[PDB]
Amino acid sequence: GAMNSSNYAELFNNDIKLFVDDTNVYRVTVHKTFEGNVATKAINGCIFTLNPKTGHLFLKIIHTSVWAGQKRLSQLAKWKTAEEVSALVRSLPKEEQPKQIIVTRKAMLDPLEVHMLDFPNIAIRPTELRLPFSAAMSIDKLSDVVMKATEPQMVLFNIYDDWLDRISSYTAFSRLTLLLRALKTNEESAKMILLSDPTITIKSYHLWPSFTDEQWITIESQMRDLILTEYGRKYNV
Protein backbone atom coordinates (compact mmCIF):
# COMPACT_ATOMS: atom_id res chain seq x y z
CA GLY A 1 0.00 0.00 0.00
CA ALA A 2 1.03 3.60 0.65
CA MET A 3 4.51 4.57 1.81
CA ASN A 4 4.56 6.82 4.88
CA SER A 5 6.44 7.57 8.11
CA SER A 6 5.37 4.26 9.67
CA ASN A 7 7.19 2.18 7.03
CA TYR A 8 10.04 4.58 6.23
CA ALA A 9 12.95 2.20 6.86
CA GLU A 10 11.66 -0.03 4.08
CA LEU A 11 13.30 2.38 1.64
CA PHE A 12 16.74 1.18 2.73
CA ASN A 13 16.23 -2.57 2.77
CA ASN A 14 17.64 -4.83 0.08
CA ASP A 15 14.55 -5.05 -2.19
CA ILE A 16 15.26 -2.87 -5.24
CA LYS A 17 12.88 0.09 -5.43
CA LEU A 18 12.58 3.33 -7.34
CA PHE A 19 10.85 6.60 -6.62
CA VAL A 20 9.34 8.28 -9.72
CA ASP A 21 8.60 11.98 -9.63
CA ASP A 22 6.87 13.51 -12.65
CA THR A 23 6.66 17.10 -11.42
CA ASN A 24 9.27 18.41 -13.90
CA VAL A 25 8.18 16.46 -16.99
CA TYR A 26 5.90 19.12 -18.54
CA ARG A 27 7.28 22.60 -17.88
CA VAL A 28 5.95 25.81 -19.40
CA THR A 29 6.37 29.55 -19.33
CA VAL A 30 3.08 31.45 -19.56
CA HIS A 31 3.13 34.65 -21.61
CA LYS A 32 1.03 37.18 -23.50
CA THR A 33 0.46 37.05 -27.24
CA PHE A 34 0.60 40.08 -29.54
CA GLU A 35 -3.22 40.06 -29.49
CA GLY A 36 -3.19 40.17 -25.68
CA ASN A 37 -4.22 36.55 -25.19
CA VAL A 38 -2.25 34.09 -23.05
CA ALA A 39 -0.16 31.23 -24.41
CA THR A 40 2.32 28.72 -23.08
CA LYS A 41 5.78 27.84 -24.34
CA ALA A 42 7.14 24.48 -23.23
CA ILE A 43 10.70 24.06 -22.02
CA ASN A 44 12.65 20.87 -21.62
CA GLY A 45 11.74 18.71 -18.65
CA CYS A 46 12.80 15.50 -16.99
CA ILE A 47 11.61 12.39 -15.20
CA PHE A 48 13.29 11.99 -11.78
CA THR A 49 13.65 8.24 -11.10
CA LEU A 50 15.73 7.51 -8.00
CA ASN A 51 16.90 4.40 -6.15
CA PRO A 52 16.93 5.66 -2.53
CA LYS A 53 19.25 2.92 -1.33
CA THR A 54 22.07 3.43 -3.82
CA GLY A 55 21.57 7.03 -4.95
CA HIS A 56 21.12 5.96 -8.65
CA LEU A 57 19.24 8.85 -10.46
CA PHE A 58 17.94 7.76 -13.95
CA LEU A 59 17.30 11.32 -15.32
CA LYS A 60 15.26 10.97 -18.52
CA ILE A 61 15.28 14.34 -20.25
CA ILE A 62 11.96 15.23 -21.92
CA HIS A 63 12.66 17.39 -24.94
CA THR A 64 9.98 19.87 -26.01
CA SER A 65 9.59 18.13 -29.40
CA VAL A 66 7.65 15.33 -27.70
CA TRP A 67 4.79 17.79 -27.15
CA ALA A 68 4.59 19.00 -30.77
CA GLY A 69 1.08 18.72 -32.13
CA GLN A 70 -0.26 16.99 -29.04
CA LYS A 71 -3.32 17.93 -27.00
CA ARG A 72 -4.05 17.74 -23.27
CA LEU A 73 -0.35 17.95 -22.44
CA SER A 74 -0.65 17.67 -18.66
CA GLN A 75 -2.49 14.37 -19.10
CA LEU A 76 -0.11 13.19 -21.80
CA ALA A 77 2.85 13.97 -19.55
CA LYS A 78 1.74 11.38 -17.00
CA TRP A 79 1.41 8.69 -19.71
CA LYS A 80 4.75 9.66 -21.28
CA THR A 81 6.30 9.37 -17.80
CA ALA A 82 4.83 5.89 -17.40
CA GLU A 83 5.95 4.86 -20.89
CA GLU A 84 9.54 5.94 -20.18
CA VAL A 85 9.66 4.27 -16.73
CA SER A 86 8.33 1.06 -18.27
CA ALA A 87 10.99 1.30 -21.01
CA LEU A 88 13.70 1.78 -18.37
CA VAL A 89 12.57 -1.27 -16.44
CA ARG A 90 12.57 -3.38 -19.63
CA SER A 91 16.09 -2.16 -20.40
CA LEU A 92 17.46 -3.35 -17.06
CA PRO A 93 18.68 -6.91 -16.47
CA LYS A 94 16.14 -8.95 -14.55
CA GLU A 95 18.25 -8.91 -11.37
CA GLU A 96 18.33 -5.07 -11.51
CA GLN A 97 14.64 -4.51 -12.08
CA PRO A 98 12.75 -3.00 -9.13
CA LYS A 99 10.33 -4.97 -6.98
CA GLN A 100 8.39 -1.77 -6.22
CA ILE A 101 7.96 1.62 -7.87
CA ILE A 102 6.81 4.44 -5.58
CA VAL A 103 5.16 7.43 -7.33
CA THR A 104 5.32 10.81 -5.62
CA ARG A 105 1.95 11.87 -7.07
CA LYS A 106 -1.11 9.63 -7.01
CA ALA A 107 -2.17 10.67 -10.51
CA MET A 108 0.74 8.54 -11.77
CA LEU A 109 -0.74 5.32 -10.36
CA ASP A 110 -3.06 4.31 -13.20
CA PRO A 111 -0.73 5.35 -16.06
CA LEU A 112 2.14 3.43 -14.52
CA GLU A 113 -0.01 0.41 -13.63
CA VAL A 114 -1.28 0.19 -17.21
CA HIS A 115 2.20 0.49 -18.73
CA MET A 116 3.54 -2.17 -16.34
CA LEU A 117 0.84 -4.81 -16.96
CA ASP A 118 3.63 -7.06 -18.31
CA PHE A 119 5.26 -6.91 -14.82
CA PRO A 120 2.52 -8.11 -12.43
CA ASN A 121 5.07 -8.76 -9.67
CA ILE A 122 6.29 -5.13 -9.58
CA ALA A 123 4.19 -3.27 -7.01
CA ILE A 124 3.12 0.28 -7.92
CA ARG A 125 2.71 2.30 -4.73
CA PRO A 126 1.74 5.82 -3.70
CA THR A 127 3.25 7.68 -0.78
CA GLU A 128 1.90 9.91 1.98
CA LEU A 129 5.29 11.65 2.24
CA ARG A 130 5.58 15.10 0.66
CA LEU A 131 8.95 14.67 -0.95
CA PRO A 132 10.78 17.66 -2.33
CA PHE A 133 11.94 16.08 -5.58
CA SER A 134 10.51 18.95 -7.65
CA ALA A 135 13.51 20.97 -6.44
CA ALA A 136 15.78 18.67 -8.48
CA MET A 137 16.00 21.38 -11.11
CA SER A 138 17.60 23.63 -8.48
CA ILE A 139 20.70 21.40 -8.65
CA ASP A 140 22.78 23.32 -11.16
CA LYS A 141 24.30 20.35 -13.00
CA LEU A 142 20.91 18.68 -13.44
CA SER A 143 19.23 21.86 -14.68
CA ASP A 144 22.16 22.43 -17.06
CA VAL A 145 21.90 19.04 -18.79
CA VAL A 146 18.10 19.33 -19.10
CA MET A 147 18.16 22.83 -20.65
CA LYS A 148 20.99 22.01 -23.05
CA ALA A 149 19.40 18.85 -24.46
CA THR A 150 18.54 19.03 -28.16
CA GLU A 151 16.90 15.57 -28.27
CA PRO A 152 15.54 12.95 -25.84
CA GLN A 153 18.37 11.63 -23.67
CA MET A 154 18.87 9.61 -20.49
CA VAL A 155 21.66 10.79 -18.14
CA LEU A 156 22.78 8.67 -15.20
CA PHE A 157 23.89 10.49 -12.00
CA ASN A 158 24.50 9.37 -8.41
CA ILE A 159 22.60 11.94 -6.29
CA TYR A 160 24.55 11.07 -3.12
CA ASP A 161 28.01 11.76 -4.63
CA ASP A 162 30.41 9.60 -2.51
CA TRP A 163 28.44 10.00 0.72
CA LEU A 164 27.76 6.27 1.07
CA ASP A 165 31.47 5.68 1.75
CA ARG A 166 30.95 7.44 5.08
CA ILE A 167 27.20 7.35 5.94
CA SER A 168 24.29 4.97 5.58
CA SER A 169 21.54 5.16 2.98
CA TYR A 170 19.07 6.30 5.64
CA THR A 171 21.31 9.25 6.55
CA ALA A 172 22.09 10.03 2.90
CA PHE A 173 18.40 10.16 1.98
CA SER A 174 17.69 12.38 4.99
CA ARG A 175 20.46 14.73 3.90
CA LEU A 176 19.20 14.77 0.32
CA THR A 177 15.61 15.47 1.34
CA LEU A 178 16.79 18.24 3.69
CA LEU A 179 18.85 19.90 0.95
CA LEU A 180 16.00 19.64 -1.54
CA ARG A 181 13.39 20.88 0.93
CA ALA A 182 15.64 23.91 1.56
CA LEU A 183 16.15 24.58 -2.14
CA LYS A 184 12.39 24.33 -2.59
CA THR A 185 11.55 26.75 0.24
CA ASN A 186 14.20 29.41 -0.49
CA GLU A 187 16.44 28.59 -3.43
CA GLU A 188 18.62 31.70 -3.18
CA SER A 189 19.40 31.29 0.53
CA ALA A 190 19.87 27.53 0.22
CA LYS A 191 22.35 28.04 -2.61
CA MET A 192 24.08 30.81 -0.64
CA ILE A 193 24.52 28.38 2.26
CA LEU A 194 26.01 25.76 -0.06
CA LEU A 195 28.60 27.95 -1.84
CA SER A 196 29.40 30.74 0.63
CA ASP A 197 32.89 29.39 1.47
CA PRO A 198 34.93 29.50 -1.78
CA THR A 199 37.44 26.92 -0.44
CA ILE A 200 34.93 24.02 -0.65
CA THR A 201 34.48 22.93 -4.25
CA ILE A 202 32.18 20.60 -6.18
CA LYS A 203 34.20 17.88 -7.83
CA SER A 204 33.74 17.58 -11.59
CA TYR A 205 32.13 14.16 -11.08
CA HIS A 206 29.84 15.30 -8.21
CA LEU A 207 26.68 17.33 -7.71
CA TRP A 208 27.20 18.81 -4.22
CA PRO A 209 30.25 20.33 -2.51
CA SER A 210 33.01 18.25 -0.88
CA PHE A 211 32.13 18.91 2.76
CA THR A 212 33.87 17.20 5.61
CA ASP A 213 31.72 15.34 8.11
CA GLU A 214 31.92 18.33 10.45
CA GLN A 215 31.06 20.79 7.68
CA TRP A 216 28.02 18.69 6.71
CA ILE A 217 26.71 18.99 10.27
CA THR A 218 27.04 22.78 10.06
CA ILE A 219 25.49 22.87 6.56
CA GLU A 220 22.61 20.64 7.67
CA SER A 221 21.93 22.89 10.67
CA GLN A 222 21.89 25.97 8.43
CA MET A 223 19.35 24.30 6.13
CA ARG A 224 17.07 23.50 9.07
CA ASP A 225 17.27 27.10 10.28
CA LEU A 226 16.32 28.27 6.76
CA ILE A 227 13.35 25.91 6.57
CA LEU A 228 12.27 27.25 9.96
CA THR A 229 13.22 30.85 9.10
CA GLU A 230 11.14 30.71 5.91
CA TYR A 231 8.33 29.02 7.81
CA GLY A 232 8.14 32.11 10.03
CA ARG A 233 8.41 34.63 7.19
CA LYS A 234 5.51 32.76 5.58
CA TYR A 235 3.24 32.27 8.61
CA ASN A 236 4.46 35.30 10.63
CA VAL A 237 5.59 33.30 13.69
Partner 1 sequence: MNTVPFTSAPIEVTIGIDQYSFNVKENQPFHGIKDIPIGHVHVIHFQHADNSSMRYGYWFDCRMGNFYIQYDPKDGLYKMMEERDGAKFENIVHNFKERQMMVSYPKIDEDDTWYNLTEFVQMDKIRKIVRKDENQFSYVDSSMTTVQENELSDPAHSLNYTVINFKSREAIRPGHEMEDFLDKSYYLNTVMLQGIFKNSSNYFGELQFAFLNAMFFGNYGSSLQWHAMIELICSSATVPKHMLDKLDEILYYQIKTLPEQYSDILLNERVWNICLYSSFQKNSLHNTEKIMENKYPELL
Ligand X SMILES: Nc1cccc(C(=O)N2CCOCC2)c1
Is the Cβ of residue 158 or residue 229 nearer to ligand X in the bound state? Answer: 158
User: Which residue from 79, 119, 170, 211 is in contact with partner 1, where contact means CB under 8 A?
Assistant: 79
User: Would you give the binding string for partner 1 spanning residues 21-40, x where CB under 8 A is met?
Assistant: --------------------
Q: How many CB atoms lie within 10 A of CB 158?
A: 16
* Ramachandran bin of 55, using left for φ above 0, alpha for ψ from -120 to 50, beta for the remaining angles: left
Residue 230 binds: one of partner 1, ligand X, none (C-beta under 5 to 8 A by kind) = none
Sequence letter at residue 110: D
Binding segment for partner 1 (CB under 8 A), chosen from 24-32, 79-87, 181-189, 211-219, is 79-87
Distance (Å, rounded) from C-alpha 193 to C-alpha 11? 28
Asked if 158 touches ligand X (CB under 6 A), the answer is yes
Distance (Å, rounded) from C-alpha 70 to C-alpha 54? 36
Distance (Å, rounded) from C-alpha 91 to C-alpha 97? 9
Asked if 117 touches partner 1 (CB under 8 A), the answer is yes
CB of 80 to partner 1, least distance (A): 9
Binding segment for partner 1 (CB under 8 A), chosen from 35-43, 78-86, 153-161, 220-228, is 78-86
User: Would you give the binding string for ligand X spanning residues 98-137, x where CB under 6 A is met?
Assistant: ----------------------------------------
Residues 6+ apart with CB under 8 A from 85: 18, 20, 47, 49, 101, 112, 115, 116
CB of 83 to partner 1, least distance (A): 7
Q: Per residue in 126-141, is it b (16+ CB within 10 Å) or e — as a string?
A: bbebebbbbbbbbbee
CB of 166 to partner 1, least distance (A): 43
Task: List the interface residues with ligand X, window 46-105 (CB under 6 A).
Answer: 56-58
Residue 57 binds: one of partner 1, ligand X, none (C-beta under 5 to 8 A by kind) = ligand X
Asked if 68 touches partner 1 (CB under 8 A), the answer is no
| Binding stretches for ligand X (CB under 6 A) | 56-58, 156, 158
| Binding stretches for partner 1 (CB under 8 A) | 76, 79, 82-83, 110-111, 113-115, 117-118
